[PDB]
Design a protein around this ligand. Structure first.
Ligand SMILES: [Zn+2]
Ligand SMILES: [Zn+2]
Ligand SMILES: [Zn+2]
Ligand SMILES: [Zn+2]
Ligand SMILES: [Zn+2]
Ligand SMILES: [Zn+2]
Lengths: 73, 632, 311, 87
């Protein structure tokens, strides 16, 4: 009876334990989120809802800073 | 082949091949019925030429020492024709002398490697004769045994018993070794293979004689109870040793041939041949020219020469491991753990390695993150509901959607019960898609992704890419007729593979439940009923089909509406001979619904009655007066 | 389950399970077939019987379906294939527990591969060895197991080879129940798929490209619901090739062979490949004594999951 | 034929079981039919693999197969048969 060595490589359970995000989204997964969010934020500012455009632009810029100024000065 | 060097074909008849025992020559001899000659091979062009043509089983072995220019060919039974090599292209005849003493034919002979004048002989007369050249035979020992098959000398190689010993084999399977200096009745009488022993040979270094036989065995015998045994399985006729030094007995090569092929085995690995030279026709003889050159003839009348150091080995093309799977997750996974041995020096027995791959994987995962799939398969097989069970067609479709919604809800409930969310969500999606289709039927370019057909097909494709067999077969049961998912062949193949997978485990009732309500009618077999049993009557001998009773009860149940009248139909009565009932063998009561037939005598029985008699009473006989012990 | 040691005195060439996953049979080079059964108690392998079968090394084995009885077919270098049936009458490990049924002595060269057909073809035996011809033996009456008739004899090679020792012939059947009969041949270095036509004679269906060395193994994938079928081949170079086979309905269906993967993680020679029953998890053998598990990723390619090595 | 019963006219075996599709009348089955003093248990295990058929619909089962199957269902296991073989 000899010794048997087993080494797991790329286990899906370990990789699921090694992240906190619900999905592993990338730029190619959602190809044109930026333009759609920007144009809907502009249409939101056409309406009387200025908070919601800030919310949607914050979601867009959070993802943009995740995968990679007039408000300063 | 790769190791083939010489392949010259001679159209004349060939019966044996040997070589000239001389280092400064490149000639080989041949034999035949009326064709004797010497052939010279040239290693430059890798071709064999002819030298001089001069013109019943025997040798074509040449002489030694100063008599190296002589050969021996049996001409007519008890004929010893000694030819010459120097006196070939001359006025003088190649023949030197003729010797005839044997009453029967001569089988084998050998020239001595030390005393070149002494020539041995032997045939069916059980006489061993020594012929002196520089001088009737010298010593004739009549052992009065059976016909001698092979006589060989002791090999006096150039590496006191150098050329004074010889051996012979009889048809009685006895190996006899004698001494030339002091002849006697028997110096060493050893047993051999049963029946007629055909051939033997001598080890060039140690006192060992390997004897062939017609039984298919080649046993190595100690002549200092065989030390080795190679069950070849074919009658061994010819064998030639490799003319090399061998300090170790196992460090030797033995060529075994009988359809005959040149199979160069090894003495340390008797189970695998080292070198095989099968040519294209069955062989008639073979010879070793040197330690690396081997020559032979075959039925194709071709003189062939091989180099054993350029010829590959069998050992190479011998699989060293294999892998098999027992089930899906990996509860059984074998791999042969063996060490690749060599032809030189036994072999340690390999350890066959099984592993519980899910258990070891779970242990590895729990160890790493610290900083039973079979039971689940059985449970999900047993508790999921695989089975389903112009305005009228619309109402039927509406009811089909409604109870499919109910079935999807039940399958989600059982998944949520075993706390598996990843498959609970699948059936929630399926239920919501069926609700969408139900409201679209009630209210009555590319398809949207949330359509009730595309979502179900995509979930099925994701399941069959993931490997979840239960869900990818459950969707194929529940959503095949109304929604065309895939080809009918692929769906039926998937149902069949799930059924065979269920049969691989000990879950047969679940397989029966799956197979009973399968909408595909030709999954397992095409003969229809293969559990149906037809009986002949015990009083008249006609077949119990009961057509009259079935017809009358069908007509009565058609008239009266209720179908409980058809429960009176059965095969426990005969309509031709008016048999009343079949009785139990133990209690003699009427028997209608379930029986337990005792096999060798053919008697009925209730389950409780037969189980009582064969288990509770511990009685091994049939309870109807039968002598045949149908025990247990 | 724990690893166990067999009594074989030489190299084990082919190990094949039964249908129910409790009987294992090993054929070895020391002319012995040892069959082991998995005991219910303590989950350990126990010996059933051990009998000598042939006069050479036995290189192939394949159980039959349990509906036709406990039939074991072994192929060796003695140009013969012998069928063996278990006997419960004789005592276990006595050696008389198994009995011959028929010796397939219809070969000129040494036979390499013996394989049992899917059960919807009946009891059919596939044989392929050094003669370069694929021999199919049918049981026209499955009632008697000692009767065997050759029915299909297709020349898978153009000519017999010269280096007959440097050859390996492997067979693998197709477990698709409702597709036409498909048989895989790896003769010397070319892999041929054989389909049964309307004339009742076998024909070349499709040819697997590549295979720059000798194909040491072949295994078809049980396609549970997939619209495509997978073939695993193992070459002498150490390359594991997984072919994707798409079947669409002279043969009545055409086969499109598209290479899906090629992995060379085995620094040696892949002797054997295998599939699990889902057609997903693939295991391969090799010359290094390592066992590698291969699983399909999110893409269409395959990747290694574990490397089981033996120390 | 104490362990394998066959037809004498042509050799064909018995009709198969309706639960496992294995031939009937043969012992030494490759599995243990554990239907619902170890000698008594062995006798029960070797008794459970006998011939058994309903006399109202003529469909055969193993004894252990019928004992394990009729403890959870009430219909004949063959497809297309409507016969409550239990009672
Ligand atoms: Zn009658
Ligand atoms: Zn009774
Ligand atoms: Zn009786
Ligand atoms: Zn059964
Ligand atoms: Zn019934
Ligand atoms: Zn029935």
């Amino acid at each position: 009876m000899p010794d048997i060595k087993v080494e797991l490589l790329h286990d899906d359970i370990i990789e699921a334990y090694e992240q906190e995000d619900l999905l592993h989204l990338e730029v190619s997964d959602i190809p044109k989120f930026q333009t759609y969010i920007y144009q809907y934020s502009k249409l939101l500012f056409r309406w009387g809802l200025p908070l919601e455009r800030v919310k949607i632009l914050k979601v867009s810029t959070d993802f943009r800073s995740s995968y990679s100024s007039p408000y300063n000065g | 082949s790769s190791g083939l060097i010489y392949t010259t074909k001679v159209d004349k008849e060939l019966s044996s091949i040997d070589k000239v025992n001389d280092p400064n020559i490149n000639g080989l001899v041949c034999a035949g019925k009326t064709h004797l000659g010497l052939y010279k091979f040239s290693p430059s062009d890798r071709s064999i030429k002819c030298v001089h043509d001069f013109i019943t089983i025997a040798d074509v072995k040449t002489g030694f020492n100063n008599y190296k220019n002589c050969i021996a060919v049996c001409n007519n039974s008890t004929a010893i024709s000694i030819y010459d090599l120097n006196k070939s292209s001359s006025i003088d005849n190649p023949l030197i002398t003729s010797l005839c003493e044997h009453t029967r034919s001569i089988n084998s002979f050998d020239f001595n490697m030390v005393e070149s004048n002494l020539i041995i002989s032997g045939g069916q007369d059980s006489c061993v004769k020594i012929w002196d050249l520089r001088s009737r035979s010298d010593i004739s020992i009549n052992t009065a045994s059976d016909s001698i098959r092979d006589v060989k000398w002791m090999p006096g190689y150039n590496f006191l018993k150098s050329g004074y010993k010889f051996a012979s084999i009889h048809d009685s399977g006895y190996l006899l070794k004698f001494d030339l200096r002091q002849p006697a009745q028997y110096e060493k009488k050893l047993n051999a293979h049963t029946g007629p022993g055909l051939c033997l040979n001598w080890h060039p270094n140690q006192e060992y004689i390997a004897t062939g036989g017609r039984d298919g065995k080649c046993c190595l015998w100690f002549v200092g109870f065989p030390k080795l045994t190679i069950n070849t399985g074919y009658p061994v006729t010819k064998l030639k040793f490799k003319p090399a030094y061998s300090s170790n007995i196992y460090n030797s090569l033995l060529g075994i041939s009988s359809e005959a092929e040149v199979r160069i085995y090894s003495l340390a690995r008797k189970y695998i041949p080292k070198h095989v030279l099968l040519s294209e026709t069955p062989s008639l003889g073979l010879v070793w020219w040197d330690e690396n050159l081997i020559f032979n003839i075959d039925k194709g009348t071709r003189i062939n020469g091989w180099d054993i150091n350029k010829e590959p080995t069998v050992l190479e093309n011998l699989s060293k491991n294999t892998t098999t799977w027992r089930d899906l997750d990996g509860n059984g996974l074998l791999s042969v753990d063996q060490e690749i041995g060599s032809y030189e020096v036994a072999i340690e027995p390999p350890c066959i390695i099984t592993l519980d791959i899910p258990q070891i994987f779970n242990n590895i995962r729990l160890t790493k993150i610290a900083h039973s799939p079979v039971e689940k398969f059985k449970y999900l097989a047993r508790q999921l509901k695989f089975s389903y069970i112009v305005e009228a067609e619309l109402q039927e479709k509406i009811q089909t959607l409604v109870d499919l919604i109910s079935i999807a809800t039940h399958n989600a409930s059982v998944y949520l019960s075993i706390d598996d969310l990843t498959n609970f969500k699948i059936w929630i999606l399926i239920r919501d898609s069926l609700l969408w289709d139900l409201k679209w039927m009630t209210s009555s370019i590319a398809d949207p992704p949330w359509d009730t057909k595309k979502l179900i097909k995509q979930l099925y494709n994701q399941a069959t890419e993931t490997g979840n067999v239960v869900l990818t077969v459950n969707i194929l049961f529940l959503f095949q007729t109304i929604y065309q998912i895939t080809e009918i062949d692929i769906a039926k193949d998937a149902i069949a593979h799930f059924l065979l997978l269920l049969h691989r485990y000990e879950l047969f009732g679940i397989a029966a439940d799956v197979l009973k309500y399968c909408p595909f009618e030709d999954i397992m077999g095409s003969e229809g009923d293969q559990s149906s049993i037809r009986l002949f009557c015990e009083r008249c001998g006609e077949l119990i089909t009961n057509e009259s009773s079935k017809e009358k009860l069908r007509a009565e149940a058609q008239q009266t509406g209720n179908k409980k009248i058809m429960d009176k139909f059965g095969y426990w009565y005969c309509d031709s001979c008016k048999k009343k009932n079949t009785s139990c063998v133990l209690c003699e009561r009427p028997l209608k619904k379930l029986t337990m037939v005792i096999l060798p005598c053919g008697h009925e029985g209730h389950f409780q009655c037969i189980q009582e008699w064969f288990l509770d009473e511990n009685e091994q006989e049939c309870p109807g007066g039968c002598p045949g012990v149908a025990f247990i | 389950m724990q690893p166990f040691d067999s009594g074989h005195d030489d190299l084990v060439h082919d190990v094949v399970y039964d249908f129910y996953g409790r009987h294992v049979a090993t054929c070895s080079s020391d002319q012995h077939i040892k069959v082991f059964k998995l005991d219910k108690d303590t989950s350990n392998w126990e010996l059933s019987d051990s009998w000598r079968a042939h006069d050479s090394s036995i290189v192939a084995i394949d159980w039959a379906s349990p509906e036709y009885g406990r039939i074991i077919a072994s192929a060796s270098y003695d140009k013969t294939v012998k069928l063996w049936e278990e006997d419960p009458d004789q005592e276990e490990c006595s050696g008389r527990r198994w009995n011959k049924l028929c010796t397939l002595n219809d070969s000129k060269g040494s036979l390499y591969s013996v394989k049992f057909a899917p059960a919807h073809l009946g009891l059919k035996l596939a044989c392929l060895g050094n003669d370069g011809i694929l021999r199919l033996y049918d049981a026209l009456e499955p009632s008697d197991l000692r009767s065997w008739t050759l029915t299909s004899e297709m020349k898978v090679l153009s000519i017999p080879p010269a280096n007959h020792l440097q050859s390996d012939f492997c067979l693998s059947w197709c477990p698709s129940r409702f597709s036409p009969e498909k048989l895989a041949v790896s003769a010397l270095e070319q892999a041929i798929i054989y389909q049964r036509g309307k004339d009742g004679k076998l024909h070349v269906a499709a040819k697997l490209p590549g295979h720059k060395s000798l194909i040491r193994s072949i295994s078809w994938a049980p396609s549970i619901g997939r619209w495509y079928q997978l073939i695993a081949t193992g070459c002498k170079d150490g390359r594991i090739r997984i072919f994707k086979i798409t079947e669409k309905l002279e043969l009545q269906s055409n086969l499109q062979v598209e290479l899906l993967s090629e992995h060379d993680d085995h620094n040696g020679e892949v002797w054997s490949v295998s599939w699990n029953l889902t057609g997903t998890i693939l295991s391969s053998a090799g010359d290094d004594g390592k066992v590698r598990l291969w699983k399909a990723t999110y893409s269409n390619e395959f990747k290694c999951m574990s490397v089981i090595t033996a120390q | 034929p104490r362990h394998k019963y066959c037809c004498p006219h042509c050799g064909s075996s018995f009709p198969r079981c309706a639960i496992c599709l294995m031939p009937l009348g043969t012992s030494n089955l490759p599995f243990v039919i554990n239907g619902t003093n170890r000698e008594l248990v062995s006798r029960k295990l070797k008794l459970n693999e006998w011939f058994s058929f309903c006399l109202s619909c003529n469909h055969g089962m193993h004894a252990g197969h019928a004992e394990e199957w009729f403890d959870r269902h009430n219909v004949c296991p063959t497809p297309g048969c409507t016969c409550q073989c239990n009672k």
